Amino acid sequence: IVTQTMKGLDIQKVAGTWYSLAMAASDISLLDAQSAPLRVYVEELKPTPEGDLEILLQKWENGECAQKKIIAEKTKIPAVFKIDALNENKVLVLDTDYKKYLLFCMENSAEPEQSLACQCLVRTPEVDDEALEKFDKALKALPMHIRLSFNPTQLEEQCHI
Amino acid sequence: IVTQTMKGLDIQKVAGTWYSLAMAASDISLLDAQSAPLRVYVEELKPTPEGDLEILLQKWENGECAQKKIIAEKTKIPAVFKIDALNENKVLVLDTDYKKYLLFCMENSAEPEQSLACQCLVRTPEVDDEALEKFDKALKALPMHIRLSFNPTQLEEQCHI
Ligand SMILES: CCCCCCCCCCCCCCCC(=O)O
Ligand SMILES: CCCCCCCCCCCCCCCC(=O)O
Numbered sequence: 001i002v003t004q005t006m007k008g009l010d011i012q013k014v015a016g017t018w019y020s021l022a023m024a025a026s027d028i029s030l031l032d033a034q035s036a037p038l039r040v041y042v043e044e045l046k047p048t049p050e051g052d053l054e055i056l057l058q059k060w061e062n063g064e065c066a067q068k069k070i071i072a073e074k075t076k077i078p079a080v081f082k083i084d085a086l087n088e089n090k091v092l093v094l095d096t097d098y099k100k101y102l103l104f105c106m107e108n109s110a111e112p113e114q115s116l117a118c119q120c121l122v123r124t125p126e127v128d129d130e131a132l133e134k135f136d137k138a139l140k141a142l143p144m145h146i147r148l149s150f151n152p153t154q155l156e157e158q159c160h161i
Numbered sequence: 162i163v164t165q166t167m168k169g170l171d172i173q174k175v176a177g178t179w180y181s182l183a184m185a186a187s188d189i190s191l192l193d194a195q196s197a198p199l200r201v202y203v204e205e206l207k208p209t210p211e212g213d214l215e216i217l218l219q220k221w222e223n224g225e226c227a228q229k230k231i232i233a234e235k236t237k238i239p240a241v242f243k244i245d246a247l248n249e250n251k252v253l254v255l256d257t258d259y260k261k262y263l264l265f266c267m268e269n270s271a272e273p274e275q276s277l278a279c280q281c282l283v284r285t286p287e288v289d290d291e292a293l294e295k296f297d298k299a300l301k302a303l304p305m306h307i308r309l310s311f312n313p314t315q316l317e318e319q320c321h322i
Binding site for chain 2: 028032033034144145146147148149150151
């Protein structure tokens with residue numbers, strides 16, 4: 001159900017180092033335990049010359065932090081990509097300045113609170129209230145029910161432990 | 162570190178039925194799993210003639226919802242009570258109208274983000290954006306890192322399952 005998208009996105013310009021500052025989901029179970037489905041920690045974004053998106057992240061799987069590699073396929077809309085996987089999962093870029101934050105959402109393309117998850121990406125292991133403001137504003141319309149935030153020390157650890 | 166307290170509290174007037182609408186803690190681990198330390202669901206408040214506070218709640222203990230009974234001892238300040246337990250745990254009433262919401266916090270009396278947890282109590286199994294607004298406002302100053310919200314259907318279930 002996400003209604004915000006970044007106009008004139010330059011997907012080449014969001015490459016490099018990112019930290020998952022905060023996370024929010026429509027249902028508590030998507031982010032609840034350490035091995036929840038959308039409880040992922042993004043490490044780096046590597047956009048393909050063909051404007052695709054190679055995504056590096058950590059995800060707590062079977063009692064330990066495992067580095068993952070996912071591909072987001074480009075789409076006729078430049079802020080929306082499709083993850084190459086089952087049950088179709090769309091990735092929407094809401095807003096970014098490329099150099100400080102990146103607001104994106106994740107939705108099992110079925111409905112709003114159906115299966116929704118969003119994050120606040122920031123380039124540094126600092127908490128950025130500016131980015132978090134915008135993060136919560138953007139989500140204000142969304143049926144979010146769980147919301148995480150991490151501290152600098154946590155951001156420098158695998159799986160934010 | 163909580164800096165808001167309800168002036169002129171009438172602790173006799175907050176008795177009866179309450180629902181835990183939302184929860185927030187200074188550290189993710191206090192509310193994370195189903196059996197986290199401050200992941201409690203308040204059922205009813207029963208204030209003692211001697212202005213003490215008998216508290217009824219559910220808490221997921223050893224893989225199942227267990228009803229608990231805790232006593233909050235009155236204090237020289239009327240919005241602050243001490244739970245009869247170890248490691249001194251203070252309970253602060255931030256704000257209420259007795260008939261719709263009640264904002265309270267819980268702090269292992271050591272420091273702000275040390276061990277903090279707050280809730281948004283409401284009299285009905287309805288989501289009250291008014292109460293949730295005020296809830297988030299009050300917490301705006303607080304180092305909260307986890308935040309839960311529940312839906313009507315969940316509020317009518319034991320342990321909000
Ligand atoms: C511009 C895009 C930046 C944000 C990148 C989107 C993050 C990935 C979203 C889908 C992750 C896949 C679900 C968990 C991963 C896994 O289990 O392998
Ligand atoms: C006016 C006060 C209303 C709010 C009531 C405070 C709720 C209780 C706070 C402390 C709960 C004790 C911790 C978990 C309970 C247990 O393990 O038995």
